A paper describes a structure:
We used the same design strategy to generate higher-affinity binders for NPY and GCG. Using weak parametric binders as a starting point, we extended their binding interfaces and redesigned their sequences to generate a 231-nM-affinity binder for GCG and a 3.5-µM binder for NPY after screening 96 designs. As a first experimental test of partial diffusion, we started from our parametrically designed Inpainted binders to GCG (with 231 nM Kd) and NPY (with 3.5 µM affinity). To gain insight into the structural rearrangements generated by partial diffusion that contribute to the affinity increases, we solved the structures of the original Inpainted GCG binder and the partially diffused higher-affinity GCG binder. Both designs were very close to their design models. Alignment of the two crystal structures on the structurally conserved C-terminal residues (16–29) of GCG showed that in the partially diffused GCG binder a 2.7-Å shift towards the target in the binder backbone enables an isoleucine to fit into a pocket previously occupied by a phenylalanine side chain at position 13 (left inset). Similarly, at position 16, a 3.6-Å shift in the backbone allows a tyrosine residue to pack underneath the peptide and form a hydrogen bond to the peptide backbone where previously a serine could not make any contacts (right inset). These backbone movements and accompanying sequence changes increase the interaction shape complementarity (0.62 versus 0.67) and contact molecular surface (431 Å2 versus 522 Å2; computed on the crystal structures).
Residue numbers in the entry:
A (entry chain B): 173 to 197
B (entry chain A): 1 to 162
Write the structure that this text describes.
Amino acid sequence: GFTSDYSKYLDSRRAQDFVQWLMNT
Amino acid sequence: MLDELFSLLNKMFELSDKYRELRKELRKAIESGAPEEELRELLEKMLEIAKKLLELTKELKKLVEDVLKNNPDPVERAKAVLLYAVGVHILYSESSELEVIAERLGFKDIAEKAKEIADKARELKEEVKRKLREIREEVPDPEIRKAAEEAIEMLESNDKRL
């Protein structure tokens, strides 16, 4: 089973939000 | 300092976004019965993204080694490894999936090459996981300890679906 296009987009959004948190903390 | 790590990571994110669009195009090409060479060219571009991601992750790793050797701030050193862990996550996520995609479609050439990147990314994932656990034990900062925990969960999230 392959993960959906949107689930792939969420994983990228979470990683970006994580990186964004690191540089504003 | 960390600014150069962010710059490399933005490149990886734009490469990951292109990878997702190609994955989208690849799905629609299969759904419409596109010719095999049309799928190969889409798979080749994804492979080139996987290789550029690996090159960036190796670059990111060298910059983190410089931060770990020179920066006296333990929280800044931990943030460098946390940023590098995100890069390794991006590399493993796309390379591991590209290998599985190429295998399911029957492209052994592209599956073997993607597999080589995934195997290298896997050893990078294991190495950064060891450093992440050492950060939770060595850095008292609750948010940096919390961040190391999540970055581990992030890295392990790929192998769960696989």
